[PDB]
Design a protein around this ligand. Structure first.
Ligand SMILES: *[C@@H]1O[C@H](CO)[C@@H](O[C@]2(O)O[C@H](CO)[C@@H](O[C@@]3(O)O[C@H](CO)[C@@H](O)[C@H](O)[C@@H]3O)[C@H](O)[C@H]2NC(C)=O)[C@H](O)[C@H]1NC(C)=O
Ligand SMILES: *[C@@H]1O[C@H](CO)[C@@H](O[C@]2(O)O[C@H](CO)[C@@H](O)[C@H](O)[C@H]2NC(C)=O)[C@H](O)[C@H]1NC(C)=O
Ligand code: BNG
Ligand code: BNG
Ligand code: BNG
Ligand code: BNG
Ligand code: BNG
Ligand code: RET
Ligand code: PLM
Ligand code: PLM
Ligand code: PLM
Ligand code: HG
Ligand code: HG
Ligand code: HG
Ligand code: ZN
Ligand code: ZN
Ligand code: ZN
Ligand code: ZN
Length: 340
């Protein structure tokens, strides 16, 4: 056999040398060198040191500036939060693991690690479907009359949390499960073994279809309609606003892919070629690289949303003077409404 199946794991290392051992009981240093682990540990340490402030600041600024209530500002508050969950929920355990060499906290540390990453990535995917719509109703405007009040914005955010849970919560209760991957420092869904005892085979399709293919077809086709109205470049007059938020909601989709396609791809490969011959390094790269999903969203936001960027500077400068190159929002300053 080219892997070592366990009742809890599956190390992608042969054990015709009795060197293999439970990623929940001893260092996996025979899978690679002790420094590559120190790399993962340094790398995660930086991810935590970065995703934390970026996401926390984002959260903070959104709430402090009382006029940042568009559905988009809503969605990003959501991501900023989900992201903070990953940071503490999972990255905490994935850092301690990479350090001490194995899932020293057993399956729990593994479900923390694995659960909070899925929760975080699916929330991002399902959020992208919300934006894919909120974006459809503003450009290819349907009803001769409509705009999303915070009313409907709190709807789509509550939604991404149901869908995300529908996908990440099951493995914690008996449908599929979180098992360590790569150098065994991160935990993912079970693609490795059939384990009829929990039905991993069923879930993995449930997930690849209900939580990957479909949201992707939705998000892709919806875009095919928004291929005339708001063309694709960038640089009333209130049209260059929604014509710009859109170019953002689109760079968010490129990024999601860049992040999960390589993982999802390797994950689907495994499922299809279970028990074949792959190494620990195989999935360690797309798995760990995807952990940057806990921080790129706010970066895109702060760079593609002139409005938020200044609101961020405004909070950071306590007062103002945001060296810009259009409307507003804040607190005791000009957070006054200007509707109709
Ligand atoms: C690869 O093959 C190895 C041997 O061929 C397996 O190693 C062991 O089976 O590991 C167990 C640990 O569970 C050892 O038995 C001990 O440790 O069991 C209890 C732990 O619950 C201890 O308290 C006792 O002291 C036992 O020694 C075995 O000694 C050891 N086998 C050997 C080297 O003879 C190894 O698990 C296997 N890899 C896999 C499939 O994970
Ligand atoms: C062990 O791993 C090897 C490497 O994949 C498996 O060999 C291989 O996959 O076998 C399939 C059919 O069984 C061939 O079509 C293919 O050519 C092989 N891959 C190569 C290029 O070596 C082998 O099947 C695995 N054994 C198991 C299931 O434990
Ligand atoms: C997408 C760029 C175009 C901006 C319009 C979309 C978001 C609408 C924000 O509306 C404002 O929300 C405030 C509460 O947050 C209300 O107090 C205020 O009366 C209302 O007018
Ligand atoms: C982190 C996410 C990475 C996404 C990077 C996306 C940047 C690619 C932008 O494309 C370019 O936009 C110009 C303006 O419209 C076009 O004139 C040009 O032909 C097109 O190639
Ligand atoms: C990590 C994600 C950040 C990468 C940014 C993705 C490339 C999109 C570039 O588009 C341009 O950005 C300018 C901001 O200076 C806008 O003023 C301009 O109208 C817009 O067309
Ligand atoms: C869009 C990015 C998605 C990435 C998906 C990558 C999955 C392809 C894996 O290929 C296989 O890897 C094995 C060991 O690594 C080789 O032994 C085998 O010959 C090779 O065919
Ligand atoms: C994205 C790259 C795809 C490659 C997938 C297989 C990589 C497996 C690497 O294995 C490791 O190589 C070290 C140096 O040879 C050995 O010391 C160690 O024991 C072995 O476990
Ligand atoms: C380091 C830990 C990781 C990456 C753990 C778990 C991730 C998943 C189970 C991923 C789910 C997927 C996402 C977020 C995006 C589309 C579908 C999917 C299965 C690839
Ligand atoms: C000029 C561009 C910089 C972009 C670079 C791409 C090269 C790839 C990164 C792969 C990340 C792998 C994850 C870290 C594992 C620790
Ligand atoms: C509200 O407006 C908050 C004030 C923001 C001021 C930020 C000052 C930055 C700190 C300067 C550090 C310079 C390097 C010092 C090295 C010893
Ligand atoms: C306004 O006074 C000029 C801006 C310079 C001060 C801003 C300091 C740099 C921002 C660093 C971000 C850290 C925020 C931490 C959030 C938890
Ligand atoms: Hg769209
Ligand atoms: Hg990314
Ligand atoms: Hg602002
Ligand atoms: Zn079992
Ligand atoms: Zn989901
Ligand atoms: Zn199978
Ligand atoms: Zn500016």
């Amino acid at each position: 056999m080219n892997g070592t199946e366990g009742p809890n794991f599956y190390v992608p290392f042969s054990n015709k040398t009795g060197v293999v051992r439970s990623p929940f009981e001893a260092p996996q240093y025979y899978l690679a060198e002790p420094w590559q682990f120190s790399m993962l540990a340094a790398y995660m340490f930086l991810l935590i040191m970065l995703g934390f402030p970026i996401n926390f600041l984002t959260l903070y600024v959104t709430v402090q500036h009382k006029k940042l209530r568009t559905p988009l500002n809503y969605i990003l508050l959501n991501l900023a939060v989900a992201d903070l969950f990953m940071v503490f929920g999972g990255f905490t355990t994935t850092l301690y693991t990479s350090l001490h060499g194995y899932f020293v906290f057993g399956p729990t540390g593994c479900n923390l690690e694995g659960f909070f990453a899925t929760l975080g990535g699916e929330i991002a995917l399902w959020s992208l479907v919300v934006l894919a719509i909120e974006r459809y109703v503003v450009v290819c405007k349907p009803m001769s009359n409509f705009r999303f009040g915070e009313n409907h914005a709190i709807m789509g955010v509550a939604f991404t949390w149901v869908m995300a849970l529908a996908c990440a919560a099951p493995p914690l209760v008996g449908w599929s499960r979180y098992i360590p991957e790569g150098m065994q420092c991160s935990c993912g869904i079970d693609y490795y073994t059939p384990h009829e005892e929990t039905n991993n085979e069923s879930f993995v399709i449930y997930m690849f279809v209900v939580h990957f293919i479909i949201p992707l077809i939705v998000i892709f086709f919806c875009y095919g309609q928004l291929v005339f109205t708001v063309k694709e470049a960038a640089a009333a007059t209130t049209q260059k606003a929604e014509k710009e938020v859109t170019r953002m909601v689109i760079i968010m989709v490129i990024a999601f892919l860049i992040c999960w396609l390589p993982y999802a791809g390797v994950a689907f490969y495994i499922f299809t070629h279970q028990g074949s011959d792959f190494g620990p390094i195989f999935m360690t790269i797309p798995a760990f690289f995807a952990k940057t999903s806990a921080v790129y969203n706010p970066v895109i936001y702060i760079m593609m949303n002139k409005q938020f960027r200044n609101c961020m500077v405004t909070t950071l400068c306590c007062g103002k003077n945001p060296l810009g190159d259009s409307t507003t929002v804040s607190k005791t300053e000009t957070s006054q409404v200007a509707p109709a």
